[PDB]
Design an enzyme around this catalytic site. Structure first.
Site, PDB file in Angstrom:
ATOM      1  N   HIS A   3      11.819  22.881 -20.576  1.00 58.99           N
ATOM      2  CA  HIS A   3      13.058  22.305 -20.427  1.00 58.99           C
ATOM      3  C   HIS A   3      13.718  22.592 -21.848  1.00 58.99           C
ATOM      4  CE1 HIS A   3      10.801  18.684 -22.443  1.00 58.99           C
ATOM      5  NE2 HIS A   3      12.075  18.650 -23.224  1.00 58.99           N
TER       6      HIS A   3
ATOM      7  N   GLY B 225      13.674  15.218 -30.196  1.00 61.98           N
ATOM      8  CA  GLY B 225      13.106  16.502 -30.855  1.00 61.98           C
ATOM      9  C   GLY B 225      11.719  16.709 -31.071  1.00 61.98           C
TER      10      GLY B 225
ATOM     11  N   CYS C  88       9.414  17.007 -28.906  1.00 62.49           N
ATOM     12  CA  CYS C  88       9.094  17.563 -27.816  1.00 62.49           C
ATOM     13  C   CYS C  88       8.449  18.729 -28.169  1.00 62.49           C
ATOM     14  CB  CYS C  88      10.179  18.016 -26.390  1.00 62.49           C
ATOM     15  SG  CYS C  88      10.838  16.413 -25.779  1.00 62.49           S
TER      16      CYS C  88
END
Ligand SMILES: [Zn+2]
Ligand SMILES: [Zn+2]
Lengths: 306, 306
Positions: free
Chosen positions: B41, B143, B145
């Site tokens: 993603h 942020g 991830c």
């Protein structure tokens, strides 16, 4: 979101840990530039620790009595000197992995990370506070001496603790990197007692703000209070008294959440008198005091390091 | 002595974290050999996350649409490919700091360390368990991830988790390093619910053994019980049932302390029915379940890593 007892990344410090041996005793040292720092009781045997005369003991040791190992590499000891309760071993080779660093003596209630080591090798990393009685409630086995505590400010490592001993009560004591003990402890194996371990009130308050940020609001109450009336309740429960400096520290958290420091104090008061009543705050049934106001800000905003 | 929620040293993993950008989205990736792993993603905008068609979205991206930064160094993307829910970016340069590593898919109840990162930079390290409902109760901001979870076995790093999302309930979900989610979650921003979060009974028992090792014995009781009678009480309190495999795991702790697994079970039972009564065990007023039997052994014997 969420909230966790977080430690600093330890990569910068793993590269500074060495194994120091003198005679039949082995512990950890810290290799920075061309100097190795370690507990001076490396030169003692199990019998010497009862009543050591470190000056007399050190006179009978030469530069070649010290074995320093950087992994599987040998460092040559070309000079030694005792400063307070640490030995400073001057070695021939500078550590190529020395980070930007400084030495700092912290105040009680501050937090740091501990890199627990055995035989110069990292074993794990955890976060703790310096208690108001200058002890730390750590996790140390035999051979962990010389393990170090540190903070990180972007790219600079602030070393603030070196582990020296376990007290008969199971708590832990050590020095700054200049070799001065925190608290009135000495590096001798004798009945030593610490004073009363009080709760770090300013840290409890920071943690209550973190809970509100993360959606735990049940403890919020409709009362308010004054600094004096709150401190008189706190002292009854062996909480540290709050000062105006602590109110200034919490200012940014007060602004983010819209909750006055004194309103938070009145919530804590009610908790001290009426207990949690079986509830939890951020997954804890007890009031946590190992987060400083800086830690809360750091975690709730996402600060990083290089 | 003492007992602390300990994380693995993170030095080996800090050197593998990079910043990955695609379009206007930036998150973390893991740089091992000449491949960078990151959440797929990364190629989505805030609107795409509502109902992404990753295949269609990825067709419109070329190797030069991906920015990979190793600190302040640029990695050239020479190949990309989607495997389940991770992107695999083949880069021109192998990481000189790649450690001995492997990929592993862990089972619920296992523990690992999380290195929380933002913009490719480490922020902190903490230990957690994989809950029985395949979520983790972490600390992640926007942020984070692509942050990774790992175990260390001496010199080998076992990567077992990559953070992908926060659920509307504030808990966290992610994948193994092959890109298969833990649990039935998907990488879409939609009402997703996890099942019941049960307590990891085998871990609670390991922690009770740790308490006894460290001198907390008050909970020890004079009763005993059977596996069946205990499991029927456990299930009433949303505890995982214990099996003979769990009894085998606890064998070494049973031998060290001289306390039969089933005798420990009978103590826990009494605690589940009669509560702590305001007492603490190892400084906790709740039963902790984020230590596995291996963790307890590791800490109570002083294992290290290189
Ligand atoms: Zn010692
Ligand atoms: Zn994300």
């Amino acid at each position: 979101s969420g909230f966790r007892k977080m430690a600093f990344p330890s990569g910068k410090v793993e590269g500074c840990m060495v194994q120091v041996t003198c005679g039949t005793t082995t512990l950890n040292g810290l290799w920075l530039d061309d100097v190795v720092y370690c507990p001076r009781h490396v030169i003692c045997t199990s019998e010497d620790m009862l009543n050591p005369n470190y000056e007399d003991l050190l006179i009978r040791k030469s530069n070649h009595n010290f074995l320093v190992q950087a992994g599987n590499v040998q460092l040559r000891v070309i000079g030694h000197s005792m400063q307070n309760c640490v030995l400073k071993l001057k070695v021939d080779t500078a550590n190529p992995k020395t980070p930007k660093y400084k030495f700092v003596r912290i105040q009680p209630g501050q937090t740091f990370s501990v890199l627990a080591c055995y035989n110069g090798s990292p074993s794990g990393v955890y976060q703790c506070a310096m208690r108001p009685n200058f002890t730390i409630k750590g996790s140390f086995l035999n051979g962990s001496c010389g393990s170090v505590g540190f903070n990180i400010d972007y790219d600079c490592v602030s070393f603030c603790y070196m582990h020296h001993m376990e007290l008969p009560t199971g708590v832990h004591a050590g020095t700054d990197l200049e070799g001065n003990f925190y608290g009135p402890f000495v590096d001798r194996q004798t009945a030593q007692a610490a004073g009363t371990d009080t709760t770090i009130t300013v840290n409890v308050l920071a943690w209550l703000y973190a809970a509100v940020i993360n959606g735990d609001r049940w403890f919020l109450n409709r009362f308010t209070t004054t600094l004096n009336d709150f401190n008189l309740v706190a002292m009854k429960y062996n909480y540290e008294p709050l000062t105006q400096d602590h109110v200034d520290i919490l200012g940014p958290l007060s602004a983010q959440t819209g909750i006055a420091v004194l309103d938070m104090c009145a919530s804590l008061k009610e908790l001290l008198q009426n207990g949690m009543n079986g509830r939890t705050i951020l997954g804890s049934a007890l009031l946590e005091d190992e987060f400083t106001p800086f830690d809360v800000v750091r975690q709730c905003s996402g600060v990083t390091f290089q």
